[PDB]
């Protein structure tokens with residue numbers, strides 16, 4: 001009942017997914033591929049997972065369905081979503097990642113990959129249609145495929161071999177581990193690159209990290225760790241490690257779209273593709289920016305139409321490298337799905353090459369002061385109603401303070417309100433969980449904080465009133 005596609009992935013409550021649904025959705029997927037002639041009897045399907053409590057069970061159900069359908073499940077254990085996809089795509093095989101990514105800890109999901117990339121919105125519909133048509137099925141777990149570290153090792157080597165052993169010697173970097181599937185990978189990879197890494201804040205409890213809505217606790221932790229004069233940066237990822245979480249030499253967060261810009265510069269990108277929620281200062285630096293709806297499938301579909309490299313990224317910080325990049329005789333092949341290691345390493349490499357701290361690098365882009373947050377536990381019907389309210393000219397004027405007039409409204413993806421002052425407030429329903437997003441831009445830190453608070457209070461009040 002909670003289980004549906006949305007922005008990307010099939011997601012919903014862990015207690016619903018952990019059972020027949022995970023098995024049946026996996027069956028729908030593989031049978032969808034086989035029907036289309038793309039999967040033949042005995043072909044490999046790679047499965048990976050994150051560190052959510054339900055993830056081992058859900059992976060085992062997925063692997064059961066793969067095998068019952070007549071295909072070969074390959075257990076890749078615990079690893080980043082981009083590691084699984086990089087490896088499976090290199091093997092020309094589909095894959096399934098078990099993760100809820102950023103979503104709350106009572107939820108989980110499945111992220112589906114074809115042999116050549118993320119599933120698209122047509123695929124999502126064909127899976128849902130196939131799922132609907134399945135019989136009333138004998139769900140079965142597969143614990144029997146021994147874990148292979150091949151995918152994690154290949155992924156590590158992608159970066160080690162591209163930058164080269166010892167190429168970042170001199171850096172000292174904190175690794176905020178929490179429950180990131182890359183918590184250990186980052187330690188050994190950084191060490192191989194000549195960085196001195198320091199483990200910080202490992203958690204035996206799953207921590208849902210949303211890089212577009214950091215917990216005040218994580219912000220305070222990054223500041224506290226990063227206030228040491230001993231660290232050049234703190235690096236991390238979210239749960240399934242498709243998004244970076246990067247802080248500078250003072251422990252201040254570098255917003256994901258700025259890490260994305262730093263990465264675009266580093267790889268010498270010709271065209272950038274990013275959603276509408278990315279910082280509006282991007283176009284000031286980069287002359288070819290294609291703006292999209294929010295979500296990886298939208299970014300990928302625009303990247304695919306583009307003929308240096310094509311780079312995609314979102315304000316969540318995930319980077320989608322669209323073209324092979326060359327450097328000092330070494331290649332980094334295209335990986336058109338969100339990655340955290342690329343932006344992390346691009347940021348560290350920039351610091352290393354320019355002998356300049358990350359805060360100065362970040363400031364050099366002159367980004368508008370942006371903030372983002374979300375309200376949790378907001379049903380789809382309630383966020384749909386609120387967003388409709390904002391389409392009424394009278395209602396908009398009623399909800400916002402009179403002194404700053406709304407001069408433009410866009411409904412490309414949610415509702416974005418542009419003000420005469422230059423302020424902007426953007427609301428979106430999350431497609432991945434019952435949450436309402438509020439993103440703002442303003443002219444300085446004080447005004448931005450006030451604007452973020454106002455935007456969230458306006459939504460809170462209107463949501464309570466409509467109830």
Ligand SMILES: O=C[C@H](O)[C@@H](O)[C@H](O)[C@H](O)COP(=O)(O)O
Nearest residue numbers: 007008295296314316430431432
């Ligand atoms: O979130 C995960 C999405 O699939 C990702 O591609 C998207 O850009 C944002 O991280 C937020 O999307 P929502 O705001 O819809 O949750």
Ligand SMILES: [Mg+2]
Nearest residue numbers: 101102238242
């Ligand atoms: Mg994620």
